[PDB]
């Protein structure tokens, strides 16, 4: 049930790619009649230790708005087997469905992301990579958090996890404590959600992305100096602007995600209630 043989994993196309990881669409067809189910397969281009930790996290997560763990494919090597969501990420889905997805549907997606994130927090995890590119579309009515590559477990009686590695990170979705001290709280994921909500409301328009907006604020910056300028911009109280046609009530909840201090930010449960109060 949870074990998948490499020989039966029939590669169809690439779904996503990171620095050391890749996700491919496969058809697990043990009968050899092309009737088996389509699955998402996470493999490596040590990073094995990380992938094993990611497998363990996803195996332990079971929620309507969290990509379903299916099993593993062992080669020393290992592959993570997940369900395949045919519509892909919000980053790809939203620019192609601008006339289909109205504000009501975007708020239903925000509720769904927050429910998935609240459950993640209840398990004492910090995602650290909440962006539209990691929110997958099951159908026009449902989304799921679909990647856990940077997810860490907060130790019991601790409020945050401290990152100790040399890995790359989505700095444009990061809260000040992440940027300044490499500290990741549940309140750090709330900040990233705020940024993800901004993307969702702009229909993931490339010219309106956090990197594009912040880079037009900051200017020519260089990989070394990006973080210090970003921190300086945030310290000055600058934030991503209200997307076009975003009502004030929605932008107010977004601003509650961007309080400089983690202890002053809204919770995911307060966000759920807040968005549901707006859905009629
Ligand atoms: O690619 C990565 N992670 C994931 C989140 C990305 C896409 N992923 C998954 N994608 C899908 N379906 C689908 C359909 N179309 N497309 C293309 C992009 O719109 C993706 N289902 C399950 C998934 F698990 C996994 C890490 C860097 C390697």
CSV table of C-alpha atoms and ligand atoms in Angstrom, one decimal:
chain,number,residue,atom,x,y,z
A,1,UNK,CA,0.0,0.0,0.0
A,2,UNK,CA,2.7,2.5,1.0
A,3,UNK,CA,5.6,1.0,-1.1
A,4,UNK,CA,6.1,1.9,-4.7
A,5,UNK,CA,8.6,0.0,-7.0
A,6,UNK,CA,10.8,2.3,-9.2
A,7,UNK,CA,10.3,0.1,-12.3
A,8,UNK,CA,6.5,0.7,-12.2
A,9,UNK,CA,6.9,4.5,-11.8
A,10,UNK,CA,6.4,5.6,-15.4
A,11,UNK,CA,7.7,9.2,-15.9
A,12,UNK,CA,5.3,11.5,-17.8
A,13,UNK,CA,6.6,15.1,-17.2
A,14,UNK,CA,8.4,17.5,-14.8
A,15,UNK,CA,6.1,19.2,-12.2
A,16,UNK,CA,8.6,21.3,-10.3
A,17,UNK,CA,12.3,21.8,-9.6
A,18,UNK,CA,14.4,23.2,-6.7
A,19,UNK,CA,18.1,23.4,-6.1
A,20,UNK,CA,18.6,19.7,-5.2
A,21,UNK,CA,15.1,18.3,-5.6
A,22,UNK,CA,12.6,17.7,-8.4
A,23,UNK,CA,8.9,16.6,-8.6
A,24,UNK,CA,7.8,14.5,-11.6
A,25,UNK,CA,4.4,13.3,-12.7
A,26,UNK,CA,4.4,9.5,-12.9
A,27,UNK,CA,1.9,6.7,-13.6
A,28,UNK,CA,2.3,3.8,-11.1
A,29,UNK,CA,1.3,1.0,-13.4
A,30,UNK,CA,2.1,-2.5,-11.9
A,31,UNK,CA,-0.5,-4.2,-14.1
A,32,UNK,CA,1.4,-2.9,-17.3
A,33,UNK,CA,-1.9,-1.9,-19.0
A,34,UNK,CA,-1.6,1.9,-18.5
A,35,UNK,CA,-4.5,2.0,-16.0
A,36,UNK,CA,-2.6,2.7,-12.8
A,37,UNK,CA,-3.0,6.1,-11.0
A,38,UNK,CA,-1.0,9.2,-11.6
A,39,UNK,CA,1.2,10.3,-8.7
A,40,UNK,CA,3.6,13.2,-7.8
A,41,UNK,CA,7.2,11.8,-7.2
A,42,UNK,CA,9.7,13.8,-5.3
A,43,UNK,CA,13.4,12.9,-5.9
A,44,UNK,CA,16.9,14.3,-5.7
A,45,UNK,CA,18.8,15.7,-8.7
A,46,UNK,CA,23.3,15.1,2.6
A,47,UNK,CA,20.1,15.9,0.8
A,48,UNK,CA,18.9,12.3,1.4
A,49,UNK,CA,18.8,13.0,5.2
A,50,UNK,CA,16.6,16.1,4.5
A,51,UNK,CA,14.2,14.2,2.1
A,52,UNK,CA,13.8,11.4,4.7
A,53,UNK,CA,12.9,14.2,7.4
A,54,UNK,CA,10.4,15.6,4.8
A,55,UNK,CA,8.8,12.1,4.3
A,56,UNK,CA,8.4,11.7,8.1
A,57,UNK,CA,6.7,15.2,8.4
A,58,UNK,CA,4.2,14.5,5.5
A,59,UNK,CA,3.4,10.9,6.7
A,60,UNK,CA,2.4,12.6,10.0
A,61,UNK,CA,0.1,15.2,8.3
A,62,UNK,CA,-3.5,14.3,7.4
A,63,UNK,CA,-5.7,17.2,6.4
A,64,UNK,CA,-8.2,18.2,3.6
A,65,UNK,CA,-5.9,21.2,2.6
A,66,UNK,CA,-2.6,19.3,2.8
A,67,UNK,CA,-1.3,17.2,-0.1
A,68,UNK,CA,-1.8,13.6,0.6
A,69,UNK,CA,1.1,11.3,1.4
A,70,UNK,CA,0.9,8.1,-0.6
A,71,UNK,CA,4.2,6.3,0.2
A,72,UNK,CA,7.9,5.8,-0.7
A,73,UNK,CA,10.1,4.5,-3.5
A,74,UNK,CA,13.5,3.1,-2.2
A,75,UNK,CA,16.5,2.8,-4.6
A,76,UNK,CA,20.3,4.1,-0.3
A,77,UNK,CA,18.2,6.4,-2.4
A,78,UNK,CA,14.6,7.4,-1.7
A,79,UNK,CA,11.6,9.1,-3.4
A,80,UNK,CA,8.5,10.6,-1.8
A,81,UNK,CA,5.2,9.6,-3.4
A,82,UNK,CA,2.2,12.0,-3.2
A,83,UNK,CA,-1.1,12.5,-4.9
A,84,UNK,CA,-1.1,14.4,-8.1
A,85,UNK,CA,-3.2,17.7,-8.3
A,86,UNK,CA,-3.8,18.2,-12.0
A,87,UNK,CA,-4.4,22.0,-12.0
A,88,UNK,CA,-1.0,22.7,-10.5
A,89,UNK,CA,0.0,25.6,-8.3
A,90,UNK,CA,-1.8,29.0,-7.8
A,91,UNK,CA,1.3,30.6,-9.4
A,92,UNK,CA,0.3,28.8,-12.7
A,93,UNK,CA,-3.5,28.4,-12.2
A,94,UNK,CA,-4.4,32.1,-11.4
A,95,UNK,CA,-3.0,34.0,-14.4
A,96,UNK,CA,-5.0,31.6,-16.7
A,97,UNK,CA,-8.3,31.9,-14.7
A,98,UNK,CA,-8.6,35.7,-14.0
A,99,UNK,CA,-12.2,35.7,-15.3
A,100,UNK,CA,-13.2,32.5,-13.5
A,101,UNK,CA,-11.9,33.3,-10.0
A,102,UNK,CA,-13.7,36.2,-8.3
A,103,UNK,CA,-13.0,37.7,-4.8
A,104,UNK,CA,-15.4,35.2,-3.1
A,105,UNK,CA,-13.3,32.2,-4.5
A,106,UNK,CA,-10.0,33.8,-3.5
A,107,UNK,CA,-11.2,34.2,0.1
A,108,UNK,CA,-12.4,30.6,0.1
A,109,UNK,CA,-8.8,29.7,-0.9
A,110,UNK,CA,-7.4,31.9,1.9
A,111,UNK,CA,-9.7,30.1,4.5
A,112,UNK,CA,-8.4,26.8,3.1
A,113,UNK,CA,-4.7,27.8,3.2
A,114,UNK,CA,-5.3,29.1,6.9
A,115,UNK,CA,-7.0,25.8,7.9
A,116,UNK,CA,-4.1,23.8,6.4
A,117,UNK,CA,-1.6,26.1,8.2
A,118,UNK,CA,-3.5,26.1,11.6
A,119,UNK,CA,-3.4,22.2,11.5
A,120,UNK,CA,0.4,22.3,10.6
A,121,UNK,CA,1.0,24.6,13.7
A,122,UNK,CA,-1.1,22.4,15.9
A,123,UNK,CA,1.4,19.6,15.0
A,124,UNK,CA,4.2,22.0,16.2
A,125,UNK,CA,5.6,22.6,12.7
A,126,UNK,CA,6.9,25.7,11.0
A,127,UNK,CA,6.5,25.5,7.2
A,128,UNK,CA,9.1,28.2,6.3
A,129,UNK,CA,8.1,28.2,2.6
A,130,UNK,CA,4.5,29.4,2.3
A,131,UNK,CA,4.2,31.0,-1.2
A,132,UNK,CA,1.6,30.6,-4.0
A,133,UNK,CA,4.0,28.3,-5.9
A,134,UNK,CA,3.5,25.8,-3.0
A,135,UNK,CA,-0.3,26.0,-2.9
A,136,UNK,CA,-1.8,23.4,-5.3
A,137,UNK,CA,-5.2,23.4,-7.0
A,138,UNK,CA,-7.2,20.1,-6.5
A,139,UNK,CA,-10.2,21.8,-8.3
A,140,UNK,CA,-11.6,25.3,-8.7
A,141,UNK,CA,-13.2,25.0,-5.2
A,142,UNK,CA,-10.2,23.4,-3.3
A,143,UNK,CA,-6.5,24.1,-2.7
A,144,UNK,CA,-3.8,22.2,-0.7
A,145,UNK,CA,-0.4,23.1,0.8
A,146,UNK,CA,1.8,21.0,-1.4
A,147,UNK,CA,5.4,21.2,-0.4
A,148,UNK,CA,7.2,20.6,3.0
A,149,UNK,CA,10.9,20.8,1.8
A,150,UNK,CA,11.8,23.5,4.4
A,151,UNK,CA,9.4,22.4,7.2
A,152,UNK,CA,10.9,22.1,10.8
A,153,UNK,CA,9.5,20.8,14.0
A,154,UNK,CA,9.5,23.3,16.9
A,155,UNK,CA,10.8,21.6,20.1
A,156,UNK,CA,8.3,21.2,23.0
A,157,UNK,CA,8.2,24.3,25.3
A,158,UNK,CA,10.0,26.4,22.6
A,159,UNK,CA,8.4,29.2,20.5
A,160,UNK,CA,10.6,28.9,17.5
A,161,UNK,CA,13.1,26.9,15.5
A,162,UNK,CA,16.6,28.4,14.7
A,163,UNK,CA,17.9,27.5,11.1
A,164,UNK,CA,21.6,26.5,11.3
A,165,UNK,CA,22.3,25.6,7.6
A,166,UNK,CA,23.8,27.1,4.4
A,167,UNK,CA,20.6,26.5,2.4
A,168,UNK,CA,18.8,29.1,0.1
A,169,UNK,CA,15.6,30.7,1.4
A,170,UNK,CA,12.5,32.6,0.1
A,171,UNK,CA,13.7,35.9,1.7
A,172,UNK,CA,10.8,38.0,0.0
A,173,UNK,CA,8.2,35.9,2.0
A,174,UNK,CA,10.2,36.2,5.3
A,175,UNK,CA,9.3,38.0,8.5
A,176,UNK,CA,11.9,40.3,10.2
A,177,UNK,CA,12.9,37.7,12.9
A,178,UNK,CA,13.7,35.2,10.1
A,179,UNK,CA,15.8,37.7,8.2
A,180,UNK,CA,17.6,39.1,11.2
A,181,UNK,CA,18.0,36.1,13.5
A,182,UNK,CA,17.1,33.0,11.4
A,183,UNK,CA,14.3,32.4,14.0
A,184,UNK,CA,11.1,30.7,12.7
A,185,UNK,CA,7.9,31.0,14.8
A,186,UNK,CA,4.3,30.0,13.9
A,187,UNK,CA,3.9,33.9,13.6
A,188,UNK,CA,6.6,33.7,10.9
A,189,UNK,CA,4.3,31.5,8.8
A,190,UNK,CA,1.5,34.0,9.4
A,191,UNK,CA,3.7,36.8,7.8
A,192,UNK,CA,4.4,34.4,4.7
A,193,UNK,CA,0.6,33.8,4.5
A,194,UNK,CA,0.1,37.6,4.3
A,195,UNK,CA,2.6,37.7,1.3
A,196,UNK,CA,0.8,34.6,-0.2
A,197,UNK,CA,-2.6,36.4,0.1
A,198,UNK,CA,-1.1,39.4,-1.7
A,199,UNK,CA,0.0,37.0,-4.7
A,200,UNK,CA,-3.5,35.4,-4.7
A,201,UNK,CA,-5.2,38.8,-4.8
A,202,UNK,CA,-3.0,40.0,-7.7
A,203,UNK,CA,-3.7,36.6,-9.5
A,204,UNK,CA,0.1,35.8,-9.2
A,205,UNK,CA,1.0,38.6,-11.8
A,206,UNK,CA,4.7,38.4,-12.4
A,207,UNK,CA,5.2,42.2,-12.4
A,208,UNK,CA,3.4,42.4,-9.0
A,209,UNK,CA,5.4,39.5,-7.3
A,210,UNK,CA,7.1,40.3,-3.9
A,211,UNK,CA,10.6,40.0,-5.5
A,212,UNK,CA,9.6,42.4,-8.4
A,213,UNK,CA,7.8,44.9,-6.1
A,214,UNK,CA,10.5,44.9,-3.3
A,215,UNK,CA,13.3,45.0,-6.0
A,216,UNK,CA,11.6,48.2,-7.6
A,217,UNK,CA,11.6,49.6,-4.0
A,218,UNK,CA,15.2,48.6,-3.0
A,219,UNK,CA,16.9,48.9,-6.5
A,220,UNK,CA,20.0,47.1,-7.9
A,221,UNK,CA,20.9,45.1,-4.8
A,222,UNK,CA,23.2,41.9,-5.3
A,223,UNK,CA,22.7,38.6,-3.6
A,224,UNK,CA,24.9,39.6,-0.6
A,225,UNK,CA,23.1,42.9,0.2
A,226,UNK,CA,19.4,41.8,-0.6
A,227,UNK,CA,18.6,40.8,3.1
A,228,UNK,CA,20.0,43.9,4.8
A,229,UNK,CA,18.1,46.3,2.4
A,230,UNK,CA,14.9,44.2,2.8
A,231,UNK,CA,15.2,44.4,6.7
A,232,UNK,CA,15.9,48.2,6.4
A,233,UNK,CA,12.7,48.6,4.1
A,234,UNK,CA,10.6,46.6,6.7
A,235,UNK,CA,12.1,48.5,9.8
A,236,UNK,CA,11.0,51.8,8.1
A,237,UNK,CA,7.5,50.4,8.1
A,238,UNK,CA,7.2,49.8,4.4
A,239,UNK,CA,4.9,46.9,3.3
A,240,UNK,CA,3.4,45.4,0.0
A,241,UNK,CA,0.7,47.8,-1.3
A,242,UNK,CA,-3.1,47.0,-1.4
A,243,UNK,CA,-3.6,44.9,-4.6
A,244,UNK,CA,-5.9,46.5,-7.2
A,245,UNK,CA,-9.6,45.9,-6.3
A,246,UNK,CA,-8.8,44.5,-2.9
A,247,UNK,CA,-11.4,45.8,-0.3
A,248,UNK,CA,-10.0,47.6,2.8
A,249,UNK,CA,-11.4,44.8,5.1
A,250,UNK,CA,-9.3,42.2,3.3
A,251,UNK,CA,-6.1,44.5,3.3
A,252,UNK,CA,-6.7,45.0,7.1
A,253,UNK,CA,-6.4,41.3,7.7
A,254,UNK,CA,-3.3,41.2,5.4
A,255,UNK,CA,-1.7,44.0,7.5
A,256,UNK,CA,-2.4,42.1,10.7
A,257,UNK,CA,0.1,39.4,9.2
A,258,UNK,CA,2.8,42.1,8.8
A,259,UNK,CA,3.2,43.5,12.3
A,260,UNK,CA,7.1,43.9,12.8
A,261,UNK,CA,6.9,42.0,16.1
A,262,UNK,CA,5.8,38.3,15.9
A,263,UNK,CA,3.8,38.5,19.3
A,264,UNK,CA,1.6,41.4,17.7
A,265,UNK,CA,0.6,39.4,14.6
A,266,UNK,CA,-2.8,37.7,14.1
A,267,UNK,CA,-3.2,33.9,14.6
A,268,UNK,CA,-4.3,31.5,11.7
A,269,UNK,CA,-7.6,30.8,13.6
A,270,UNK,CA,-8.3,34.6,13.9
A,271,UNK,CA,-7.7,34.8,10.1
A,272,UNK,CA,-10.2,31.9,9.4
A,273,UNK,CA,-12.9,33.7,11.4
A,274,UNK,CA,-12.0,37.0,9.8
A,275,UNK,CA,-12.3,35.7,6.2
A,276,UNK,CA,-15.5,33.6,7.0
A,277,UNK,CA,-17.2,36.8,8.4
A,278,UNK,CA,-16.7,38.3,4.8
A,279,UNK,CA,-18.1,35.3,3.0
A,280,UNK,CA,-21.9,35.7,2.4
B,1,LIG,O1,8.2,20.9,-7.2
B,1,LIG,C1,8.4,20.9,-6.0
B,1,LIG,N1,7.3,20.9,-5.1
B,1,LIG,C2,6.0,20.8,-5.7
B,1,LIG,C3,5.0,21.9,-5.1
B,1,LIG,C4,5.4,21.9,-6.6
B,1,LIG,C5,4.5,21.1,-7.5
B,1,LIG,N2,4.2,19.8,-6.8
B,1,LIG,C6,3.1,19.0,-7.1
B,1,LIG,N3,2.4,19.3,-8.2
B,1,LIG,C7,1.3,18.7,-8.5
B,1,LIG,N4,0.6,19.0,-9.7
B,1,LIG,C8,1.0,19.9,-10.7
B,1,LIG,C9,0.3,20.0,-11.9
B,1,LIG,N5,0.9,20.9,-12.7
B,1,LIG,N6,2.0,21.3,-12.0
B,1,LIG,C10,2.9,22.2,-12.6
B,1,LIG,C11,3.1,23.5,-11.9
B,1,LIG,O2,1.9,24.2,-11.7
B,1,LIG,C12,2.1,20.7,-10.8
B,1,LIG,N7,0.7,17.7,-7.7
B,1,LIG,C13,1.4,17.4,-6.6
B,1,LIG,C14,2.5,18.0,-6.3
B,1,LIG,F1,3.2,17.5,-5.2
B,1,LIG,C15,5.1,19.6,-5.7
B,1,LIG,C16,9.7,21.0,-5.4
B,1,LIG,C17,10.7,21.8,-6.1
B,1,LIG,C18,10.9,20.4,-6.1
